[PDB]
Design a protein around this nucleic acid. Sequence first.
DNA 1: CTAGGGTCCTAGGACCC
DNA 2: CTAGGGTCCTAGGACCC
Length: 342
Amino acid sequence: GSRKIIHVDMDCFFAAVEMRDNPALRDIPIAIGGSRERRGVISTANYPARKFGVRSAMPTGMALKLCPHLTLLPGRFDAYKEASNHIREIFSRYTSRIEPLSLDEAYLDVTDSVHCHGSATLIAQEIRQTIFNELQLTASAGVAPVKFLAKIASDMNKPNGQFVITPAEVPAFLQTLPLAKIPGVGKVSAAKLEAMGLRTCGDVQKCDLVMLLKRFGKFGRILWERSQGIDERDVNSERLRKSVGVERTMAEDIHHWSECEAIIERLYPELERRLAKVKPDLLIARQGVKLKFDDFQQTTQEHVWPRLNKADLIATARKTWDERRGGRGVRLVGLHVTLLDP
DNA sequence: CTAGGGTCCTAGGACCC
DNA sequence: CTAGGGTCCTAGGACCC
Ligand SMILES: Cc1cn([C@H]2C[C@H](O)[C@@H](COP(=O)(O)OP(=O)(O)OP(=O)(O)O)O2)c(=O)[nH]c1=O
Ligand SMILES: [Mg+2]
Ligand SMILES: [Mg+2]
């Protein structure tokens, strides 16, 4: 045999950084997100805000109606990136088998670690404590024989705790595990399963695999596997970004093409900078645009293209604007690139 | 009264052999 | 008295943080 997988996850990541750097924000409801005037949402919130119901992805106006004392911060990305680089270097003291999933979390494979006598429990404990020292931030961790259980486990003694699932404990832990707790099983999937009388991993273990393949395709095989603790996904330390985009939601819907082009002119230098970091010569596989309309419908138009090119993005966006807008107002415009393969 | 990044999967149809 | 099957494009969506 069994692997030893750790998932490490920072507690309230953006709000914890802001609370550390400004202690007057410790005991008051705060969130990182865009204002109502800017038609924004909540990136995350601290625990004082959360007991009022403030959640990641909530429209900021709803957040303020739920928590009128909410203090709203714009977010300091360089502060968060600095912390994220530090925790990942901490991870590297313990193993090179590191798969970051976002700024604030990573799977570790410590199957063959000679740290703490190979105890994944003590390694996770030591990683959490080293992060508290040095960074003055708290993390939670999960320890399990496979990825998705380690990720579920990191949520169970959150914040500032951990939870271990041994191979012996997996069958009991699975029997009653709500399917919605499985990463990748979101609102729509969960509801379709519920409509089918499937709520827990116990329910799916009684199910015909062919039946699940019929109704769900590949996802049905994943659901069948995870429901009995099968998850052979290896921790991969060699993943690279495959795309780069820049996009903006305007405070007011635009209705004139010239406004669309003007926004593209503002977006293009930013996309160029970012593509330059990871690909100095700007060579790409595809590039294209995104529009989102006043009804929250959105469309993307992209095409094979060898090199980032502003004039081609504008011409593309003119086509999208002319052919797909349908007379609607546009609330967002975005630019997009997909990188080459090897 | 609904962000901005991204991952991955599926599907319809063009293209290739 | 005409190509199926594979691959490539491409748009859209579920989902993740
Ligand atoms: C979920 C989510 C997170 N984020 C950002 C803000 C978070 O600080 C960071 C990591 O998100 P999460 O790890 O999902 O949330 P969190 O760490 O803030 O809360 P928890 O302690 O329960 O794990 O990513 C968004 O911008 N939008 C989102 O929808
Ligand atoms: Mg977190
Ligand atoms: Mg996280």
